[PDB]
Amino acid sequence: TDLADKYASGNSEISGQELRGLRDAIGDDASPEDILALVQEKIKDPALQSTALDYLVQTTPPSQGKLKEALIQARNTHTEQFGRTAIGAKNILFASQEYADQLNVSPSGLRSLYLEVTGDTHTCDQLLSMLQDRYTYQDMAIVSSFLMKGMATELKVPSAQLQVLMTETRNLQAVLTSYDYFESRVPILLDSLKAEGIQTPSDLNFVKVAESYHKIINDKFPTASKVEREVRNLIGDDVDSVTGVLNLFFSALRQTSSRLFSSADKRQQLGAMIANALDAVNINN
Amino acid sequence: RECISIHVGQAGVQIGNACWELYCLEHGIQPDGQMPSDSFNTFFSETGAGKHVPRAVFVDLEPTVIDEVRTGTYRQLFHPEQLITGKEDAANNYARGHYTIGKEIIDLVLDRIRKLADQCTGLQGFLVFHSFGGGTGSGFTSLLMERLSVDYGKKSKLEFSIYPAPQVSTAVVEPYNSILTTHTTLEHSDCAFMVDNEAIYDICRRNLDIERPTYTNLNRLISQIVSSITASLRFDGALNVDLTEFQTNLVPYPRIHFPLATYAPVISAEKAYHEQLSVAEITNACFEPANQMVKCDPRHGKYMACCLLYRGDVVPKDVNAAIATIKTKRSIQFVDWCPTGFKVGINYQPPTVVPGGDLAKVQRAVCMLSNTTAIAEAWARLDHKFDLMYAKRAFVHWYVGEGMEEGEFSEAREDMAALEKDYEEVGV
Amino acid sequence: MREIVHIQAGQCGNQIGAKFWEVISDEHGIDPTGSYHGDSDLQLERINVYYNEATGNKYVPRAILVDLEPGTMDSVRSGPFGQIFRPDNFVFGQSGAGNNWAKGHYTEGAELVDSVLDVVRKESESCDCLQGFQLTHSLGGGTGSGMGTLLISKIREEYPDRIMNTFSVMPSPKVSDTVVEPYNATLSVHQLVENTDETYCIDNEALYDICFRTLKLTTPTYGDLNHLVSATMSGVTTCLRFPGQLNADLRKLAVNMVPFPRLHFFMPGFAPLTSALTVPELTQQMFDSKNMMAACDPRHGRYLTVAAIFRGRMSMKEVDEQMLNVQNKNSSYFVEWIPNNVKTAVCDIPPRGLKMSATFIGNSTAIQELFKRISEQFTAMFRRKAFLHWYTGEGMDEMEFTEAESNMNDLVSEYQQYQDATA
Amino acid sequence: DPEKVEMYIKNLQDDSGLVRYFAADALGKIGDERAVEPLIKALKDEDPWVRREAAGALGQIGDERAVEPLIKALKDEDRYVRRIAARALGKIGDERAVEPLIKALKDEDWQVREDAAKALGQIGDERAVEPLIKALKDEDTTVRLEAALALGKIGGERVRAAMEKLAETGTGFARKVAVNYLET
Ligand SMILES: Nc1nc2c(ncn2[C@@H]2O[C@H](COP(=O)(O)OP(=O)(O)OP(=O)(O)O)[C@@H](O)[C@H]2O)c(=O)[nH]1
Numbered sequence A: 001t002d003l004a005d006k007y008a009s010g011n012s013e014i015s016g017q018e019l020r021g022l023r024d025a026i027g028d029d030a031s032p033e034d035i036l037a038l039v040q041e042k043i044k045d046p047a048l049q050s051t052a053l054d055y056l057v058q059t060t061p062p063s064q065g066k067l068k069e070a071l072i073q074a075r076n077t078h079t080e081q082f083g084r085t086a087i088g089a090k091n092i093l094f095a096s097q098e099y100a101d102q103l104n105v106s107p108s109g110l111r112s113l114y115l116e117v118t119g120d121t122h123t124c125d126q127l128l129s130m131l132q133d134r135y136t137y138q139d140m141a142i143v144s145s146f147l148m149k150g151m152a153t154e155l156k157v158p159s160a161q162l163q164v165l166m167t168e169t170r171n172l173q174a175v176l177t178s179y180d181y182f183e184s185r186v187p188i189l190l191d192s193l194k195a196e197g198i199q200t201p202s203d204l205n206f207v208k209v210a211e212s213y214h215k216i217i218n219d220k221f222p223t224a225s226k227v228e229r230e231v232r233n234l235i236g237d238d239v240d241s242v243t244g245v246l247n248l249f250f251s252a253l254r255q256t257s258s259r260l261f262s263s264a265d266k267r268q269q270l271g272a273m274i275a276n277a278l279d280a281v282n283i284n285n
Numbered sequence B: 001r002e003c004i005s006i007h008v009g010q011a012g013v014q015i016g017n018a019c020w021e022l023y024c025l026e027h028g029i030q031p032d033g034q035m036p037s038d039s040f041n042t043f044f045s046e047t048g049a050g051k052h053v054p055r056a057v058f059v060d061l062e063p064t065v066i067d068e069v070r071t072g073t074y075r076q077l078f079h080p081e082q083l084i085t086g087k088e089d090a091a092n093n094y095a096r097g098h099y100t101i102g103k104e105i106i107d108l109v110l111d112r113i114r115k116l117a118d119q120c121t122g123l124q125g126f127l128v129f130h131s132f133g134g135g136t137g138s139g140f141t142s143l144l145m146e147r148l149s150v151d152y153g154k155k156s157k158l159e160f161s162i163y164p165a166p167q168v169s170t171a172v173v174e175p176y177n178s179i180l181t182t183h184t185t186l187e188h189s190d191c192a193f194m195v196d197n198e199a200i201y202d203i204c205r206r207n208l209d210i211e212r213p214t215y216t217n218l219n220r221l222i223s224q225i226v227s228s229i230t231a232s233l234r235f236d237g238a239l240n241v242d243l244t245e246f247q248t249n250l251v252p253y254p255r256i257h258f259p260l261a262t263y264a265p266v267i268s269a270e271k272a273y274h275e276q277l278s279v280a281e282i283t284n285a286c287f288e289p290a291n292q293m294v295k296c297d298p299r300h301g302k303y304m305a306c307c308l309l310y311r312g313d314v315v316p317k318d319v320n321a322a323i324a325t326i327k328t329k330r331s332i333q334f335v336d337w338c339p340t341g342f343k344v345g346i347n348y349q350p351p352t353v354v355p356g357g358d359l360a361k362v363q364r365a366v367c368m369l370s371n372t373t374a375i376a377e378a379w380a381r382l383d384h385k386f387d388l389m390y391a392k393r394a395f396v397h398w399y400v401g402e403g404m405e406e407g408e409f410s411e412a413r414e415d416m417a418a419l420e421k422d423y424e425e426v427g428v
Numbered sequence C: 001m002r003e004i005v006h007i008q009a010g011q012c013g014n015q016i017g018a019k020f021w022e023v024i025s026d027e028h029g030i031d032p033t034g035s036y037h038g039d040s041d042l043q044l045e046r047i048n049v050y051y052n053e054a055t056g057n058k059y060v061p062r063a064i065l066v067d068l069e070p071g072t073m074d075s076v077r078s079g080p081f082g083q084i085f086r087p088d089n090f091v092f093g094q095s096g097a098g099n100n101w102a103k104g105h106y107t108e109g110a111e112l113v114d115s116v117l118d119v120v121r122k123e124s125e126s127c128d129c130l131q132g133f134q135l136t137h138s139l140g141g142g143t144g145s146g147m148g149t150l151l152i153s154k155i156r157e158e159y160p161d162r163i164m165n166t167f168s169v170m171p172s173p174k175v176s177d178t179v180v181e182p183y184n185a186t187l188s189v190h191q192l193v194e195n196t197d198e199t200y201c202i203d204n205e206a207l208y209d210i211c212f213r214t215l216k217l218t219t220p221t222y223g224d225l226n227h228l229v230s231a232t233m234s235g236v237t238t239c240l241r242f243p244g245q246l247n248a249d250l251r252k253l254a255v256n257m258v259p260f261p262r263l264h265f266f267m268p269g270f271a272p273l274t275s276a277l278t279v280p281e282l283t284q285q286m287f288d289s290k291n292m293m294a295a296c297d298p299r300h301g302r303y304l305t306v307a308a309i310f311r312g313r314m315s316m317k318e319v320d321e322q323m324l325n326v327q328n329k330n331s332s333y334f335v336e337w338i339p340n341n342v343k344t345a346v347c348d349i350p351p352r353g354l355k356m357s358a359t360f361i362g363n364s365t366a367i368q369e370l371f372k373r374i375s376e377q378f379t380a381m382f383r384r385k386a387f388l389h390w391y392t393g394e395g396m397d398e399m400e401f402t403e404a405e406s407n408m409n410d411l412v413s414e415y416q417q418y419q420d421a422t423a
Numbered sequence D: 001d002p003e004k005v006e007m008y009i010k011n012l013q014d015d016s017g018l019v020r021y022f023a024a025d026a027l028g029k030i031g032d033e034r035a036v037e038p039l040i041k042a043l044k045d046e047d048p049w050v051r052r053e054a055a056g057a058l059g060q061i062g063d064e065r066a067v068e069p070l071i072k073a074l075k076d077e078d079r080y081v082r083r084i085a086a087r088a089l090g091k092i093g094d095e096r097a098v099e100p101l102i103k104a105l106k107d108e109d110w111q112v113r114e115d116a117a118k119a120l121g122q123i124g125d126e127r128a129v130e131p132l133i134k135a136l137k138d139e140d141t142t143v144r145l146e147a148a149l150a151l152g153k154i155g156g157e158r159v160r161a162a163m164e165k166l167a168e169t170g171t172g173f174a175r176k177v178a179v180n181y182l183e184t
């Protein structure tokens, strides 16, 4: 197997065939401009084009000093042209293809998404909103793992920027993990309430419950009154319903990632707040 | 005239205890050094107050074995500074005993030996007791043998080595420790008496009728053989009156310094009443492979030297008559460039037994010392077990971790291959 | 070469760890107050290995009790021997990793670790000559797995010259219904293969199968599994606690059991399981697949090294004979290139309730079956890139999953090479 | 040699007990007077082998300077140091040692009582007659034998008067000693 097969190996977007086809198409006297034209014709993806150019420069012996220099210049030009669009996407080729398979989507689409995400400073919330508008909650977590794989792999690039984006994506993941906690426990709570003849808001789902939980923890100055208030606004005024949710929020607090708390004190303060709310909704035993 | 005994590791310390218990009985010294009242002074210094103190040093990298000597019946026999211990043992790893742990204690041991040497008017040499299989017995002994060669140049160094035996053996790595120590000790020992635990174990079972012999059973048997070898040095003798006389009479080729000791009679205490064995009978038994303390066949090899050390009610004419019968009846083939003779020694002091002890009191006994090429059979057993493990480099990482480069293993084996070829070359 | 420092992490670690203390304390004649009320002087001979002496000759365990889950403090304290433990030796957190390895190894666990290391330091100073450390934990959880393996690495950097030995409870679908267990077990195996000198593989699959198949218990609880763990732990530490020649310290056992540094995972076995048994019947049962605490068929591999411990008053002539027959009759299952690899030890003090017992420690190339079971369970999840955000969110990265996967598959391949290795 | 003596005197200060105990034994065997004050210092050594050897050495030299320090060694914790200090005091033959040796005749250890009786016989002071007569009734037969031997070295009027009394009112061994030594 040649360099073309080595390049095509694991690469779901390039065949050794098209690469050899490209190398064979490029004559020894091909100018840097000629090379790029040919690369562009057979390969539309800049990442794959840049990959092809690496293949081409690399598959060319130093004996063909003129061609290799033309190919090098072509690649240098292509890199000058695309920069990150080519190089960054090329860097995360494996990751994009792997997750494209899990999501049953296009790898280029994921690379585009990645570059989009990494092209600027984005907070966790910006990322969350950016993903919920594009994916199912089920798929979002998987997408977040692609982005994380890509950013980690970019240890070869907006260094400082990616570090911040990774911190923001980890926050996003921590939030999603919290939503998963509610996903499994909310039905149990609602079924147990239902079993005791307690009618609950028909639309009440884990997301609404989880969102209420996060409004509480992210509250700038939370109180037991605010806690109870949000819970009552959430599930209604049934003592067992309010108690159930407050108990769920209290259970959730212990399981929520530390990164989602401004300090260790914040977590304890929230617990105390929830406990006080539970006591307020238990006076009449 | 003086000899300093060095007891290294558990096997050495515990054999030394059995030896000194016997030496004391043999010379009529109580365990407090007092003697209710000169030959034995080569092994015991004499104090004006009454005390006879063993010219001995006891070393172990772990305290537990020597702590028992320090609190034992013989606690007042030795001065405490003669009993030296570390804190952590060599964990059956030669490299720990030689490099890692040994390096810490070596300087102290040497200074204590020097303090003993400075109380000698004419130090003959050293008698070193140790096991092959233990990390301290193998690793620390070779370190010490190397350093003694420097400090006491032209002084004899005689060993009593415990050749490992599966029955009692506590470590898988004992073949490695045995080859490694014998490689580094080879050019620093002048004579080495190997004691194969399987042979001593088999004698206890067969002769002494002990079904499952303990180290205590074995040690009392080893110390009878050790006593027979050193009797010449502790009593006014004619043969082997010197540590140097040992080499001259038993070591014609210098790498080939491993004589095979054979002792007779070894009668059970349970047996008496029984008819006492004659000079002819006890001599005949020396040529029986059952009575050898290393398992091998001399009827497969050739002799280089042969010493007969008698003890008790033995008459010179009876010895000559007994030897004559053995020359005419047995196949005692000597190497082509050696003497066809048997060096004989008689010590009219009867054999001493330990009151209680599994062994019975005898009227006459003999310990024959032979330098046969047949001892290479025991080297080959060890070399094979070493080969099987080294091919897969099993357990080697333990040694490399403890300041030993892997190459020392191959070098050691190469010296063993050479020793095996040397015993082969003698056979012509 | 004297004192051992015991550490128990997580729910499983503390449960199995407390039954271990209950068992050996009763063996050494110690009551939950730490007062010796024994029968033999042998009980106090090597007592300084696991116990420290207080004024009043109150023997206290050299045990460090850790969990990020605060509830485990009370579980231990309210247990039978719960009083015996040093109150300063309870290092407990505010959370409980919730089966997340990253939480125990990087976040919540790494916060508590320094406080644990302070307790390990103070127990290691009041040690004349420290042998090493012994950790009891489950690989399936978050604290026992993540924090436990963080501790192992942190202790190895502080006490590099000491032996690190563990009792690691392998997860099983038959026992725990938690999905992410193969991740936590694969991420821990990765650490253990590089940071421990000897690991006893207590497989929950074998424990369940013994209770279910052999003991006939149709619905086994943790209590029933733990009865087997306590008995196994009591037997494998017998040569350490009572006077002896063979395997007396952690390093002597290591030098005899570990031919290759990575191949240090042991298959513990014990006979009899239920409660008029002869030495041949004991030898026969102790080797039997049905009695191994790790779900591996010995017939699927070869034994590199074996340690057989007989407890009770029996013939040593019989044990030497039976162990020799078990080898010459079953020659092909023992590695040809490691001569005299099966070392047998006799202790006259039997375990409570038995007049005669046998404990087996095997380093069999058949342990690869156990790792393969975890790798198969892991691959199937990591394929779908499942639950990855729970771990990556806590700080760790995907590469650590791929590194743990490769390292465990290299371990299985390594076992296989010596299984097939021709003398 | 004068040099071997100074070398051993220097060794009495060595950190090693093996060196100190050997130096004391060697100095006793040489018998040079120069070693008397350093040996008296060695009677206060931490090591009982050194103390014992120093006591023995001092007895072998026989210098009076050693009498008061050896008298204090009769109260040593070590039974072999005590027994040797008694032997040494008898060897020196100084009268000052008679009252302390009469006390040592009542020691817990029989080897000390035996050496005290031998020493008292060697010194030959009449003050030992009545205490040695009482020692003929010792539980230890060898102590009784040495007390009778010791009175045999003393002799005289105190001995005769004590024997005439014992041959009349004394019983067992003491009676037999009184009748037999009266014939001698
Ligand atoms: N005959 C005899 N052999 C002994 C005795 N003690 C140990 N051995 C043997 O010596 C070998 C083990 O070596 P040891 O000398 O005990 O150990 P060690 O020198 O203390 O070294 P470490 O404990 O490893 O540091 C085995 O072959 C034992 O069978 C003893 O009392 N008699």
Ligand SMILES: Nc1nc2c(ncn2[C@@H]2O[C@H](COP(=O)(O)OP(=O)(O)OP(=O)(O)O)[C@@H](O)[C@H]2O)c(=O)[nH]1
Pocket: C009, C010, C011, C012, C013, C015, C016, C068, C069, C096, C097, C098, C099, C100, C138, C139, C140, C141, C142, C143, C144, C145, C169, C170, C171, C172, C175, C176, C181, C204, C207, C222, C225, C226, C229
């Ligand atoms: N044999 C045994 N296994 C146990 C026991 N308790 C839990 N397990 C197993 O331990 C694994 C889960 O680990 P846990 O100990 O519960 O987790 P942890 O270390 O406490 O960590 P957290 O979940 O954060 O509290 C599963 O494989 C369970 O089957 C016990 O008492 N004995």
Ligand SMILES: [Mg+2]
Pocket: B009, B010, B062, B065, B089
């Ligand atoms: Mg030892």
Ligand SMILES: [Mg+2]
Pocket: C010, C011, C012, C067, C069, C072, C096
């Ligand atoms: Mg828990």
